[PDB]
Design a protein around this motif. Structure first.
Motif, PDB file in Angstrom:
ATOM      1  N   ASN A  72      46.181  40.298  36.092  1.00  0.00           N
ATOM      2  CA  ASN A  72      45.990  41.316  34.798  1.00  0.00           C
ATOM      3  C   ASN A  72      44.641  41.246  34.539  1.00  0.00           C
ATOM      4  O   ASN A  72      44.285  41.720  33.253  1.00  0.00           O
ATOM      5  CB  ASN A  72      46.861  41.270  34.168  1.00  0.00           C
ATOM      6  CG  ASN A  72      49.071  42.100  34.413  1.00  0.00           C
ATOM      7  OD1 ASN A  72      48.288  42.551  34.880  1.00  0.00           O
ATOM      8  ND2 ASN A  72      49.292  41.118  34.884  1.00  0.00           N
ATOM      9  N   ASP A  73      43.842  41.176  35.468  1.00  0.00           N
ATOM     10  CA  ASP A  73      42.104  40.676  34.534  1.00  0.00           C
ATOM     11  C   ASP A  73      41.735  41.499  34.147  1.00  0.00           C
ATOM     12  O   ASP A  73      41.061  41.897  33.486  1.00  0.00           O
ATOM     13  CB  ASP A  73      41.157  39.768  35.868  1.00  0.00           C
ATOM     14  CG  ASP A  73      41.355  39.135  36.108  1.00  0.00           C
ATOM     15  OD1 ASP A  73      42.231  37.846  35.453  1.00  0.00           O
ATOM     16  OD2 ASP A  73      40.556  38.417  37.221  1.00  0.00           O
ATOM     17  N   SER A 101      43.325  44.257  31.841  1.00  0.00           N
ATOM     18  CA  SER A 101      43.912  44.117  30.863  1.00  0.00           C
ATOM     19  C   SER A 101      43.216  42.616  29.801  1.00  0.00           C
ATOM     20  O   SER A 101      44.056  41.676  29.921  1.00  0.00           O
ATOM     21  CB  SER A 101      45.425  44.294  30.281  1.00  0.00           C
ATOM     22  OG  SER A 101      46.309  45.298  31.867  1.00  0.00           O
ATOM     23  N   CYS A 102      43.049  42.910  28.758  1.00  0.00           N
ATOM     24  CA  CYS A 102      42.203  41.433  28.254  1.00  0.00           C
ATOM     25  C   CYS A 102      42.898  41.157  27.405  1.00  0.00           C
ATOM     26  O   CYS A 102      43.228  39.520  27.213  1.00  0.00           O
ATOM     27  CB  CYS A 102      40.464  42.417  27.416  1.00  0.00           C
ATOM     28  SG  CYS A 102      39.786  42.469  28.638  1.00  0.00           S
ATOM     29  N   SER A 104      46.143  40.601  28.070  1.00  0.00           N
ATOM     30  CA  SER A 104      47.978  40.600  28.734  1.00  0.00           C
ATOM     31  C   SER A 104      48.782  39.613  29.059  1.00  0.00           C
ATOM     32  O   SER A 104      49.983  39.207  29.123  1.00  0.00           O
ATOM     33  CB  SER A 104      47.043  40.509  30.761  1.00  0.00           C
ATOM     34  OG  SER A 104      46.250  39.605  30.798  1.00  0.00           O
TER      35      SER A 104
HETATM   36 NA    NA Z   1      44.312  39.620  31.975  1.00  0.00          NA
END
Ligand code: NA
Ligand SMILES: *[C@@H]1O[C@H](CO)[C@@H](O[C@@H]2O[C@H](CO)[C@@H](O[C@@H]3O[C@H](CO[C@H]4O[C@H](CO[C@H]5O[C@H](CO)[C@@H](O)[C@H](O)[C@@H]5O)[C@@H](O)[C@H](O[C@H]5O[C@H](CO)[C@@H](O)[C@H](O)[C@@H]5O[C@H]5O[C@H](CO)[C@@H](O)[C@H](O)[C@@H]5O)[C@@H]4O)[C@@H](O)[C@H](O[C@H]4O[C@H](CO)[C@@H](O)[C@H](O)[C@@H]4O[C@H]4O[C@H](CO)[C@@H](O)[C@H](O)[C@@H]4O)[C@@H]3O)[C@H](O)[C@H]2NC(C)=O)[C@H](O)[C@H]1NC(C)=O
Ligand code: Y68
Ligand code: CA
Ligand code: ZN
Length: 804
Positions: free
Chosen positions: A745-746, A748-749, A751
């Motif tokens: 999920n890189d 979405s900061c 995540s």
């Molecule tokens: Na992330």
């Protein structure tokens, strides 16, 4: 070489472009430096100005005047646009009452209503309301004709990609103008904003409207104007062309205005300096309409007022520098600004690595105003990947910001207060559309639509057959009084099999287990009805999707959902189910956590197996119909069939589980029930079209189970939400998404936080049109509603944007 010895005598703004070494006299010869010596003298007259005054009325024709007020000027087609008003007691078009144009009222010799396209650079959609006090002509066009609250541009929201999208109906990835500044590695050539390489035809793909017209015997004015030709002269030239003899006269014309984009860059979208450019554009529109009225063409011609993109507030101090992120900054080339494109500075560098670049640009500062992407991971709605000129590495820049390589790039290039190019769903980037004329509707507001749809409509307006393009022909029929193109549904190519019970449990060797051996004609004749499709009118509301390619698939019915299961890809192509407002979310019972059950309607040879997922350390699995939404404990066992299973990375399972457990019910609550169609998408060559079986680049380890690149859902309900989804009598409402299936999920900061803080934000970013999903799956949805097909096409091109 241009031997400019020839003359423009009698050739001013000629319509055929003569090449070297003869000198040119067309509206673009300036930009080529190839005009005849006397072009300025003869063709660009300025004497006496642009307006008639009382003292010029009936004058002796002085040929040196820019325009005339002499008695013969109407016959010559060269009066000043205000001639009838000043010298003949006529009224301006804007002062006249709005009167419906029920049929074209054309002069003899006019075989079809001409089309005039009035295009304005950087005309932000909100200008229509906010500048309305200073644009009486434009406002009359808008309120008397057909208009949208705004029109959506393509990404990147730059001038050239958008103008050429307007002319072709193609995404930039397909027409080839993917930005300002491009490098084509095959040509080994660079396209520059300022220069003469950009005049090479090889850059420009597709088939623009003027070419479409010419090949089909419709004559066209020349769309492009040299910057030094003033707008008054542009209008007079168009009007002169309209006075040409029938065999020589073009049917389609275009005017272009560099305003308000020019001033907007300097002063910002709403700087007080912006009022005058808006007044001036309106004056230009006034001159055109006055001129058309003089020619008796104002109830004959279809006029389109259309913008290329909007304008946002952007300043020098809102710049991110790649040097505050990368160490190797000098080993990269950056195409900078409101979008970022990155490539290696030198191809002879085997040390260049895009993975470390992306990693260094990923979630590095808390307030980071850009997000790095490999282009194939961009939201599919942007359609910005399938071209060699689009760099692998892309930066999506936040609205109001710039990205640049190093601080020296900015201060030695504040110079500006406005810019554009951002994500095309951004409000400030939206632009305008107005259509006025006999073929457009009267005082009609239409919903917002995308500019890729316009090409088809302009072809309709001109009686032309459109070249293959990315519009959905018929989706804008509601803009038109007449000339509608009447589309038919595509034919289904593959028909489904309807398998009954054909296999015994023991024939399967899938390594799957389930605690389901827990055990009366009452509710056993009842579950036979469910397996034959007795609840199918509840879960399949708009008909089965049509499969538009050759394949082998099974319709599978269940109490709570229905699926079309692909024997080729070993998973459903689509799973359909309805969740009413009153539905209850339940949990997966403790004993059923890892339950997977063989499906006795489908052969072992055409099923997935649990062993592959056990052995595949990267890959897990999920279900298309969510076990959380089962209607009963017994029904829940259906949700664990191996034929409802799909491969999912554990990181994506976080996203998918939250959507199925939390969001579907939330939507059902908000929209009064929803119908959901979900499924996998395979687009390994990022061309926006379904992959064939031999194009799949990744399988669950050791198996023939192909790994989807994306997962989609289409969520439909009744537009009138006082009716439940499953009993809707009228128009429908839809929102959809195409979620990238990524092992991390890189993107979405946030995540590492709870899904309630980041999952829905991710989904909204990947909002999609049903039409996008149709392209990617080869399916055709909504085959059986009570709605007109044109209305369904409009529905299918709708995009839920989540802007405010
Ligand atoms: Na992330
Ligand atoms: C948005 O809509 C657009 C428009 O419909 C969609 O884009 C189209 O999609 C089609 C399917 O992918 C694709 O069909 C191709 O066509 C290949 C050749 O195409 C060339 O000719 C095009 C037409 O020009 C002429 O048009 C009219 C008639 O309509 C004529 O009268 C005129 O005279 C015109 O000249 C032309 O537009 C196209 O230009 C592209 O490339 C130019 C530079 O070379 C650019 O300037 C231009 O902008 C185009 O660039 C885009 O498209 C290319 C793909 O062509 C893409 O790579 C770029 O990134 C960019 O996006 C061409 O010059 C044809 O060869 C293909 O056939 C192959 O596949 C079939 C599949 O069954 C096989 O049967 C066949 O064997 C063949 O395979 C062979 O090649 C393989 C790979 O090399 C190889 O492995 C294999 O072994 C074989 O050797 C195929 O039919 C259209 O080209 C494309 N059109 C356009 C305008 O882009 C798009 O899909 C829509 N988007 C979405 C999301 O829906
Ligand atoms: O007048 C122009 O735009 C009218 C228009 C153009 C399209 Cl494509 C669609 C439209 O809208 C539509 F389609 F809706 F009508 C309307 N332009 C004038 C300006 C100066 N300029 C150039 O001189 C130029 C640049 C590259 C070239 N390559 N080859 N010739 C070239 C010329 C570029 C600007 C845009
Ligand atoms: Ca594909
Ligand atoms: Zn601009």
């Amino acid at each position: 070489w241009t031997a400019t010895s020839g003359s423009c005598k009698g050739r001013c703004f000629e319509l055929q472009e003569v090449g070297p070494p003869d000198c040119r006299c067309d509206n673009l010869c300036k930009s080529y430096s190839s005009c005849c010596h006397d072009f300025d003298e003869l063709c660009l007259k300025t004497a006496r100005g642009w307006e008639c005054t009382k003292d010029r009325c009936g004058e002796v024709r002085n040929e040196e005047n820019a325009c005339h007020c002499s008695e013969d000027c109407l016959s010559r087609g060269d009066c000043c646009t205000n001639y009838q008003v000043v010298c003949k007691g006529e009224s301006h078009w804007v002062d006249d009452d709005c009167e419906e144009i029920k049929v074209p009222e054309c002069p003899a010799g006019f075989v079809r209503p001409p089309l005039i396209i009035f295009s304005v650079d950087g005309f932000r959609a909100s200008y229509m309301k906010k500048g309305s006090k200073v644009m009486p002509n434009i406002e009359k066009l808008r309120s008397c004709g057909t208009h949208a609250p705004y029109m959506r541009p393509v990404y990147p929201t730059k001038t050239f990609p958008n103008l050429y999208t307007l002319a072709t109906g193609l995404y930039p990835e397909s027409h080839g103008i993917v930005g300002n500044s491009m490098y084509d590695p095959v040509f080994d050539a660079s396209f520059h904003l300022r220069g003469r390489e950009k005049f090479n035809h090889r850059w420009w793909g597709g088939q623009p409207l003027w070419i479409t017209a010419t090949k089909q015997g419709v004559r066209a004015g020349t769309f492009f104007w040299s910057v030094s030709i003033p707008h008054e002269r542009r209008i007079l030239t168009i009007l002169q062309w309209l006075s040409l003899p029938d065999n020589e006269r073009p049917s389609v014309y275009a005017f272009y205005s560099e305003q308000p984009d020019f001033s907007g860059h300097k002063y910002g979208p709403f700087g007080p300096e912006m009022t005058n450019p808006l007044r001036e554009i309106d004056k230009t529109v006034g001159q055109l309409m006055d001129g058309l009225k003089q020619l008796r063409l104002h109830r004959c011609v279809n006029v389109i007022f259309v913008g290329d993109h909007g304008m946002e507030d952007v300043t020098c101090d809102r710049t991110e520098f790649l040097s505050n992120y990368l160490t190797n900054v000098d080993d990269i080339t950056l195409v900078p600004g409101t979008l970022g494109r990155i490539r290696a500075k030198s191809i002879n560098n085997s040390k260049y690595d895009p993975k470390t670049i992306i990693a260094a640009l990923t979630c590095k500062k808390p307030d980071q105003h850009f997000k790095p992407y490999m282009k194939q991971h961009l939201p599919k709605r942007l359609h910005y990947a399938n071209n060699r000129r689009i760099e692998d590495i892309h930066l999506l820049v936040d609205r109001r910001w710039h990205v640049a390589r190093k601080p020296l790039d900015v201060y030695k290039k504040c110079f500006f207060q406005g810019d554009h190019g951002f994500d095309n769903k951004v409000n400030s980037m939206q632009t305008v559309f107005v259509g006025y004329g006999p073929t457009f509707k009267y005082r009609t507001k239409v919903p917002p639509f995308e500019n890729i749809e316009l090409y088809n409509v302009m072809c309709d307006l001109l009686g032309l057959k459109p070249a293959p393009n990315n519009g959905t022909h018929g989706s804008l029929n509601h803009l038109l009084r007449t000339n509608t193109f009447r589309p038919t549904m595509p034919d289904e190519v593959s028909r489904p099999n309807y398998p009954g019970i054909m296999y015994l449990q023991s024939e399967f060797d899938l390594g799957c287990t389930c605690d389901d051996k827990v055990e009366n004609k009452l509710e056993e004749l009842n579950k036979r009805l469910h397996t034959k499709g007795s609840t199918k009118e509840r879960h399949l509301l708009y008909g089965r999707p049509a499969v538009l390619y050759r394949t082998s698939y099974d319709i599978l019915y269940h109490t709570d959902f229905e699926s079309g299961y692909s024997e080729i890809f070993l998973m459903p192509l689509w799973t359909s189910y309805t969740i009413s407002k009153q539905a209850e979310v339940s949990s997966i019972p403790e004993h059923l956590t890892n339950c997977v059950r063989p499906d006795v309607r489908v052969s072992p040879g055409f099923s997935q197996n649990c062993l592959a997922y056990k052995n595949d350390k990267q890959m897990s699995y999920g279900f298309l119909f969510p076990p959380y939404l089962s209607s009963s404990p017994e029904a829940k066992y259906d949700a664990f069939l191996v034929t409802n299973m799909v491969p999912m990375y554990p990181a994506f399972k976080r996203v998918w589980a939250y959507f199925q457990r939390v969001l579907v019910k939330k939507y059902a609550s908000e929209r009064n029930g929803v119908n959901v169609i979900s499924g996998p998408i395979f687009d390994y060559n990022y061309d926006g079209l379904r992959d064939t079986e031999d194009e799949i680049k990744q399988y669950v380890e050791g198996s023939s189970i192909p790994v989807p690149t994306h997962y989609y859902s289409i969520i439909t309900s009744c537009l009138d939400f006082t009716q439940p989804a499953d009993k809707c009598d009228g128009p429908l409402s839809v929102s959809s998404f195409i979620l990238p299936h990524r092992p991390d999920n890189d993107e979405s900061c946030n995540s590492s936080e709870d899904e309630s803080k980041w999952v829905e934000e991710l989904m909204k970013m990947h909002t999609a049109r049903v039409r996008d999903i149709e392209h990617l799956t080869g399916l055709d949805f909504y085959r059986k509603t009570s709605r007109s097909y044109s209305e369904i096409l409009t529905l299918k091109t709708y995009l839920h944007t989540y802007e405010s």
